Design a binder for this molecule. Structure first.
Ligand SMILES: *C1=CC(=O)c2cccc(O)c2C1=O
Ligand SMILES: [Cl-]
Ligand SMILES: [Cl-]
Ligand SMILES: [Mn+2]
Ligand SMILES: [Zn+2]
Length: 472
């Protein structure tokens, strides 16, 4: 078959990086009357993206024809899959021309195609590299219109280009988007925010007088921890790297950070999504059987990830560590409820009194053994969300399938619900409880900023904050 042969030969072109041959096969296909499909185009886009951008000549046919191929693919009305967007972006990156990259996203839009975050990257990051804030903000407006939500790298580039063009309003807006969407910032973003607050433009942007009641109302309206009404105060910012004490009090300025509530409606929506996700990945009847069991049990004050409590910092499963955690959770329960222990059925062992205790927990309504083949993470997570209670795990809950849970609601929920264990020689096992404040960029009523750095494990490493406070 002619289409199957083209596929065969383009696959070989891809495997060898033979761009001049792929372009001859593409043309030969036009001359032969062979219709290209989604798959054919996706190989061509990949193959074309391997061509270099020409510094010492007019651009090479590889990238030049690649953009013509992308334009023809869209004109044919072939449906893009995830490899189309990825390969389209690789081409844009190779060309290193943000205007042409932005033209690709404009083309998609004009033919009713929803662009992906990675399609915008080459455009946004290209314009930001050139210091062209105006085009960067056009690309940003285009994303907002298309409902593609930026991540930290896009916001960081927007912040940097705003700083470069001395645009204090855009710096302010971008910092609010970082607060809203990212909460805690990477090292590179943290350093960039510090540079902003110490800069001349920051020193010279401000207001001496403002309506304290308009600030008050925006604080109530926003959910807490910010107001969004603009830079306040005047003069130089005193900018220090610092820490919060266990109560959320800044060690530099003594401001008490606030605790931001989670709207119960968001929690309901999240619980429904979690249930849907769990049923897609588990055997539906297994997960449903747990849901039915959970409805008949409780109440619970805590849910334990049994595997994690047994295994964290251990060379093999420690019944001691599991059992010590159960006991300690029961002790902090106001009515001494056993925590709900979630374990794999293969665990539920070798010492008779330990097996007897596991069976006693089960008989007390405080243990569920997840079935053969299951991923027990869905079970303890659904349990803690549904019971609105503490979740005891040292799992960071960020990688692999935890990415399916998103980066807005879930990190906020974790912060309020996750209990982690730590062990010392002097004291043994400790429960580390949720903080009494929210670890998020905060803007106070008087215009003081506290910016938290993102870290892997905030019990291992002491989290650095920026305190930016006007010196007058
Ligand atoms: C925010 C404030 C607070 O006082 C508190 C107390 C106990 C448990 C919490 O999660 C919180 C909180 O998130
Ligand atoms: Cl209660
Ligand atoms: Cl005993
Ligand atoms: Mn697990
Ligand atoms: Zn402070």
């Amino acid at each position: 078959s002619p289409e199957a042969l083209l596929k065969q030969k383009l696959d070989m072109c891809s495997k060898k990086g033979d761009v001049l041959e792929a372009l001859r096969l593409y043309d030969e296909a036009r001359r032969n009357g062979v219709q290209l499909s989604q798959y054919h185009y996706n190989v061509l886009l990949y193959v074309c993206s391997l061509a270099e951008a020409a510094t010492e000549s007019s651009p090479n046919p590889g990238l030049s024809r690649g953009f013509d191929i992308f334009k023809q693919m869209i004109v044919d009305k072939v449906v893009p899959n995830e490899a189309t967007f990825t390969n389209g972006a690789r081409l844009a990156v190779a060309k290193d021309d943000p205007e042409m990259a932005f033209d690709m996203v404009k083309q998609m839009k004009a033919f009713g195609i929803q662009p992906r975050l990675r399609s915008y990257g080459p455009a946004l990051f290209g314009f930001c590299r050139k210091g062209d804030a105006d085009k960067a903000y056009e690309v940003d407006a285009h994303m907002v219109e298309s409902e593609v939500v930026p991540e930290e790298p896009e916001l960081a580039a927007l912040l940097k280009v705003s700083m470069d063009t001395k645009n204090a309003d855009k710096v302010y807006k971008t910092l609010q988007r970082l607060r809203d969407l990212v909460r805690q910032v990477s090292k590179s973003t943290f350093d960039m925010i510090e540079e902003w607050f110490k800069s001349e433009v920051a020193t010279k942007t401000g207001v001496k007088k403002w309506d304290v009641k308009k600030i008050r109302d925006a604080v109530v309206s926003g959910g807490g921890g910010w107001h969004g009404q603009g830079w306040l105060g005047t003069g130089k910012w005193n900018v220090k790297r610092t820490e919060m004490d266990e109560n959320g009090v800044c060690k530099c300025c003594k401001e008490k950070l606030v605790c931001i509530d989670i709207n119960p409606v968001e929690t309901e929506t999240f619980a429904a999504s979690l249930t849907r996700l769990a049923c897609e990945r588990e055997v539906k009847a297994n997960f449903n059987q747990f849901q039915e069991w959970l409805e008949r049990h409780g109440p619970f004050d805590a849910v334990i990830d049994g595997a994690n409590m047994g295994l964290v910092n251990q060379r093999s499963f420690s019944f001691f560590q599991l059992n010590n955690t159960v006991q300690r959770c029961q002790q902090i329960s106001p009515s001494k409820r056993l925590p709900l222990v979630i374990l794999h059925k293969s665990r539920v062992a070798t010492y008779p009194k330990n097996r007897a205790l596991l069976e006693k927990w089960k008989n007390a309504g405080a243990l569920y053994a997840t079935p053969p083949g299951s991923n027990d993470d869905w079970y303890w997570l659904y349990a803690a969300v549904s019971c609105k209670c503490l979740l005891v795990t040292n799992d960071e809950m960020r990688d692999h399938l935890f990415q399916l849970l998103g980066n807005s609601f879930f990190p906020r929920w974790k912060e309020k619900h996750q209990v982690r264990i730590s062990v010392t020689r002097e004291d043994g096992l400790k429960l580390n409880m949720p903080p009494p404040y929210s670890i998020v960029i905060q803007e106070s009523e008087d215009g003081t900023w506290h910016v938290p750095m993102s870290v892997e494990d905030d019990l291992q490493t002491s989290r650095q904050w920026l305190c930016a406070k006007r010196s007058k």
